[PDB]
Amino acid sequence: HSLQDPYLNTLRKERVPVSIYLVNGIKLQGQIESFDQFVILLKNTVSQMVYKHAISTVVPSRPVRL
Amino acid sequence: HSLQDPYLNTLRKERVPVSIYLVNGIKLQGQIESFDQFVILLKNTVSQMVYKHAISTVVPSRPVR
Amino acid sequence: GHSLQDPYLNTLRKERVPVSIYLVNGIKLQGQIESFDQFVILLKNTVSQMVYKHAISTVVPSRPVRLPS
Amino acid sequence: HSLQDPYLNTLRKERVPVSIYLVNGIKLQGQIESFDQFVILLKNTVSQMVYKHAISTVVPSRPVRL
Amino acid sequence: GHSLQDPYLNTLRKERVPVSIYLVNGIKLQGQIESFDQFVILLKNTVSQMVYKHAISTVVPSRPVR
Amino acid sequence: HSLQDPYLNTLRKERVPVSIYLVNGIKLQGQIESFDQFVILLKNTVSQMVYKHAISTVVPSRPVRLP
Ligand SMILES: Nc1ccn([C@@H]2O[C@H](COP(=O)(O)OP(=O)(O)OP(=O)(O)O)[C@@H](O)[C@H]2O)c(=O)n1
Ligand SMILES: Nc1ccn([C@@H]2O[C@H](COP(=O)(O)OP(=O)(O)OP(=O)(O)O)[C@@H](O)[C@H]2O)c(=O)n1
Ligand SMILES: Nc1ccn([C@@H]2O[C@H](COP(=O)(O)OP(=O)(O)OP(=O)(O)O)[C@@H](O)[C@H]2O)c(=O)n1
Ligand SMILES: Nc1ccn([C@@H]2O[C@H](COP(=O)(O)OP(=O)(O)OP(=O)(O)O)[C@@H](O)[C@H]2O)c(=O)n1
Ligand SMILES: Nc1ccn([C@@H]2O[C@H](COP(=O)(O)OP(=O)(O)OP(=O)(O)O)[C@@H](O)[C@H]2O)c(=O)n1
Numbered sequence A, D: 001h002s003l004q005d006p007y008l009n010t011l012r013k014e015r016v017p018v019s020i021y022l023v024n025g026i027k028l029q030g031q032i033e034s035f036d037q038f039v040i041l042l043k044n045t046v047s048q049m050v051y052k053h054a055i056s057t058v059v060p061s062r063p064v065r066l
Numbered sequence B: 001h002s003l004q005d006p007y008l009n010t011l012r013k014e015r016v017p018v019s020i021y022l023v024n025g026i027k028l029q030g031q032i033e034s035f036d037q038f039v040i041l042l043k044n045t046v047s048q049m050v051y052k053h054a055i056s057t058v059v060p061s062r063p064v065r
Numbered sequence C: 001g002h003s004l005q006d007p008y009l010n011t012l013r014k015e016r017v018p019v020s021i022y023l024v025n026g027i028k029l030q031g032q033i034e035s036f037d038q039f040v041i042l043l044k045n046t047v048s049q050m051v052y053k054h055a056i057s058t059v060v061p062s063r064p065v066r067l068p069s
Numbered sequence E: 001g002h003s004l005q006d007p008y009l010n011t012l013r014k015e016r017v018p019v020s021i022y023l024v025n026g027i028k029l030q031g032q033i034e035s036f037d038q039f040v041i042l043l044k045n046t047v048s049q050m051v052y053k054h055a056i057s058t059v060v061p062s063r064p065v066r
Numbered sequence F: 001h002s003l004q005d006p007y008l009n010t011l012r013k014e015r016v017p018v019s020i021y022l023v024n025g026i027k028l029q030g031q032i033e034s035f036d037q038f039v040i041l042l043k044n045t046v047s048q049m050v051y052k053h054a055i056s057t058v059v060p061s062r063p064v065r066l067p
């Protein structure tokens, strides 16, 4: 988790808009509200729970630093 | 489970209708009756048992805390 | 595991409740649960078969059944 | 594996013709030559090692008893 | 693991048997197995490629092996 | 981890251009900036975090030294 956790935490704390892409090709958009080992809480209209096992890639709207 | 459990449990307790989206694009709907480490029981006619490994997202029909 | 899944499958097993088992690729199987363990479900009817749980999305009983408490 | 292991072992010992369906819908056919925790070695003109993670169902050509 | 997979892959590696590796999405990769660990297989050719076992359905040797 | 980690570390230190194929057939291109047990940070027009569980293959643009 030495990369994933600080990365997700940075996006969370700075409230960076992100896109989360799913394995079926669906694009979800919002901000990382929180996360644990297995899931990410993505906010916009409501805060939906996204299982990491379904995610292919997380792409921030702007570059960020760790 | 610091987040998954309390979130699912809040949805369960408040009886909030949800959409559960499967990794193949299928959409399920109902209320969460119960859950464990590996499954979610989704009610609305007969209950159905949904394997977490097949779920992409759980989306509440209204915001919760 | 787990605390909900096993008694639910065992209830379908013991009561011979006919079920639909949907696979991750959209295939629907139908029969009765004859047996199961941690990783597989043995499904019987027209033909008997072993189903890996990793390929299953949902199990839907033909009628309501008692849920685990 | 209380059920999986004796079931695969019986198909093996009794040379039962089986059909193996993969998660992508491909059907493989033959007989179980051997297996371990993660893979099945399938035979019949073409020997191949199949990863259990890609298998949806194993369907024998006649019922087995355990 | 394990008791079948490892000697099977190791035999293919030592004997430099050309193999076909089918991915879960139906793509076929070809080459010779250069190396492997618990999670990946390195498939040697022009450039080698690192293949994640979780993406593999079957390994199919070009010739019967033992 | 004996093969995977030094292989990615080589790609990373040497900044080798790579293609990353996802299990759904999508091809990503760039360079490996960093990685851990579960994710790879892929640098292109902007960095993106890719879960290893969604990756099928990693193919360098030129031959590299193997572990
Ligand atoms: N996490 C998600 C969200 C949506 N979708 C796909 O996108 C479609 C539509 O999603 P959405 O934009 O949320 O509109 P819906 O009102 O859910 O459309 P419908 O319920 O009629 O399917 C769904 O059927 C589903 O196939 C998906 O696969 N995964
Ligand atoms: N401590 C952990 C555990 C897992 N994960 C992420 O969550 C995914 C695993 O989620 P899970 O739902 O538990 O896995 P499965 O869907 O069962 O995948 P598999 O069958 O390959 O085990 C991993 O790929 C990893 O990306 C993580 O970030 N940190
Ligand atoms: N958990 C589920 C539910 C259904 N489906 C897919 O959605 C299709 C139709 O949904 P549904 O009406 O719930 O099932 P069926 O009774 O088979 O549909 P129909 O009677 O319209 O053929 C099914 O064929 C199945 O491929 C799925 O993949 N996973
Ligand atoms: N566990 C299963 C069972 C079936 N199917 C798909 O369902 C299709 C047709 O089902 P069925 O007729 O039962 O199997 P077939 O192989 O088509 O039998 P046959 O061609 O001899 O009629 C198969 O091609 C297979 O891809 C699947 O993907 N997973
Ligand atoms: N384990 C397997 C076996 C086959 N297939 C798919 O089935 C297709 C056709 O099967 P096959 O006749 O074996 O095609 P080839 O791979 O081209 O076989 P060959 O060139 O040796 O004739 C393959 O291309 C592949 O997409 C697959 O997805 N996974």
Ligand SMILES: Nc1ccn([C@@H]2O[C@H](COP(=O)(O)OP(=O)(O)OP(=O)(O)O)[C@@H](O)[C@H]2O)c(=O)n1
Pocket: E023, E025, E027, F021, F022, F023, F024, F025, F026, F027, F056, F057
């Ligand atoms: N490990 C791989 C390699 C290929 N593909 C699929 O196969 C398609 C094309 O095959 P190929 O021609 O070999 O890939 P290209 O992207 O066109 O690269 P190149 O032609 O230079 O090999 C890709 O779009 C990709 O969807 C895949 O999913 N997994």
Ligand SMILES: Nc1ccn([C@@H]2O[C@H](COP(=O)(O)OP(=O)(O)O)[C@@H](O)[C@H]2O)c(=O)n1
Pocket: B038, B051, B052, B053, C001, C002, C005, C038, C039, C052, C053, C054, D052, D053, D054
């Ligand atoms: N004790 C267990 C272990 C796994 N399982 C189920 O089996 C799935 C994992 O099976 P598997 O080991 O075949 O997974 P893959 O990594 O092969 O996809 C989990 O997602 C659970 O649904 C279970 O129900 N109880």
Ligand SMILES: Nc1ccn([C@@H]2O[C@H](COP(=O)(O)O)[C@@H](O)[C@H]2O)c(=O)n1
Pocket: A038, A051, A053, B004, B037, B038, B039, B051, B052, B053, B054
């Ligand atoms: N601690 C856990 C264990 C499993 N799970 C769910 O159950 C599934 C178990 O699959 P594995 O056996 O491969 O771990 C995961 O894919 C995940 O959806 C979870 O969400 N939290």
Ligand SMILES: Nc1ccn([C@@H]2O[C@H](COP(=O)(O)O)[C@@H](O)[C@H]2O)c(=O)n1
Pocket: C039, C040, C052, C054, D001, D004, D036, D037, D038, D052, D053
């Ligand atoms: N202890 C175990 C773990 C996995 N398995 C099998 O191996 C596959 C699981 O692969 P995962 O390694 O990715 O855990 C499944 O087909 C499962 O039935 C097993 O048969 N015994």
Ligand SMILES: Nc1ccn([C@@H]2O[C@H](COP(=O)(O)O)[C@@H](O)[C@H]2O)c(=O)n1
Pocket: D038, D051, D052, D053, E001, E002, E005, E038, E039, E052, E053, E054, F053
């Ligand atoms: N010890 C291990 C662990 C995993 N594996 C293979 O790797 C798969 C899981 O890899 P992932 O961690 O990438 O999901 C298993 O299903 C199995 O095919 C193995 O062959 N030996």
Ligand SMILES: Nc1ccn([C@@H]2O[C@H](COP(=O)(O)O)[C@@H](O)[C@H]2O)c(=O)n1
Pocket: E039, E052, E054, F001, F004, F037, F038, F039, F052, F053
């Ligand atoms: N030791 C480890 C642990 C995880 N992994 C990667 O992280 C992913 C974790 O998902 P799973 O737990 O579902 O296997 C694996 O699919 C694999 O690609 C790895 O490559 N080596």
Ligand SMILES: [Cl-]
Pocket: B046, B047, B048, C061, C063, C064, C065, C066
């Ligand atoms: Cl019910």
Ligand SMILES: [Cl-]
Pocket: E026, E027, E028
């Ligand atoms: Cl191909």
Ligand SMILES: [Mg+2]
Pocket: B037, B038, B039, B051, B052, B053, B054
């Ligand atoms: Mg599950």
Ligand SMILES: [Mg+2]
Pocket: B053, C054
């Ligand atoms: Mg699993």
Ligand SMILES: [Mg+2]
Pocket: none
């Ligand atoms: Mg897991």
Ligand SMILES: [Mg+2]
Pocket: none
């Ligand atoms: Mg696994």
Ligand SMILES: [Mg+2]
Pocket: D053, E054
């Ligand atoms: Mg796996």
Ligand SMILES: [Mg+2]
Pocket: none
């Ligand atoms: Mg694994």
Ligand SMILES: [Mg+2]
Pocket: F004, F005, F008, F035, F036, F037, F038
């Ligand atoms: Mg690593």
Ligand SMILES: [Mg+2]
Pocket: E054, F053
């Ligand atoms: Mg995986």
